[PDB]
A and B are shown apart, each in its own frame.
Chain A
Amino acid sequence: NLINFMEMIRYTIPCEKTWGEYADYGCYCGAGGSGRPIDALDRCCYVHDNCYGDAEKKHKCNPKTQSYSYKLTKRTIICYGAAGTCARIVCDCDRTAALCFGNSEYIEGHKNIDTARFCQ
């Protein structure tokens, strides 16, 4: 569920940054993707799209809408979903993506990158 993902990101990316700086970054951060992730942070988004893809097919859930239980505390995130449900599968896709976002170097040079050039 988009709204939860954003809540999660808003909580792990460095304080000085914002969601918009993560919305259109590298080859995969944001809507869609192509090519290979250009750096570490892009890799986070690449593995996220993958996760959403394995949940929609292999597990028949609608990732961008799936409702679930997640808790933000101690600068971390915890999914309470029943270990196996779609709301839990999906929560884990977002949780590891959010945690990946906070621990990745944010390369200013890769934000808003030219897709036709760098993502072939």
Chain B
Amino acid sequence: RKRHPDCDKPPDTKICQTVVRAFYYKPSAKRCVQFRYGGCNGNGNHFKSDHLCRCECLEYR
């Protein structure tokens, strides 16, 4: 598998639906953090969970 190409873009918080809790990767913290995702999908840095997010974005050194 490859690293998600959007892991370092800012999370898309715009509103296009009722808000849901998702995680995005924060490069300046080498962690996935929870945020209010609005469903606009301006980029794919938004995952149903922490595990999925680490999986897709954690930098292997």
Q: Which residues of A contact B (CB under 8 A)?
A: 11-16, 73-75, 102
Least distance between A110 CB and chain B CB atoms (Å): 20
B60 near A15 with CB under 8 A, answer no
A15 near B56 with CB under 8 A, answer yes
Q: Which residues of B contact A (CB under 8 A)?
A: 1-3, 52, 55-56, 60-61
Chain A residues touching B, majority SS: loop
A75 near B55 with CB under 8 A, answer no
A15 near B55 with CB under 8 A, answer yes
Of the residues B52, B55, B56, B61, contact of A74 by C-beta under 8 Å: B61
Q: Complex: how many Å from CA A16 to CA B49?
A: 11
B56 — nearest CB in chain A belongs to which residue?
A: A15
Q: Which residues of A contact B55 (CB under 8 A)?
A: 15
Q: Which residues of A contact B3 (CB under 8 A)?
A: 75
Q: Which residues of B contact A11 (CB under 8 A)?
A: 1
**In the complex with contacts A75-B2, A75-B3, A102-B1, A15-B52 CB distance below 8 A:** yes
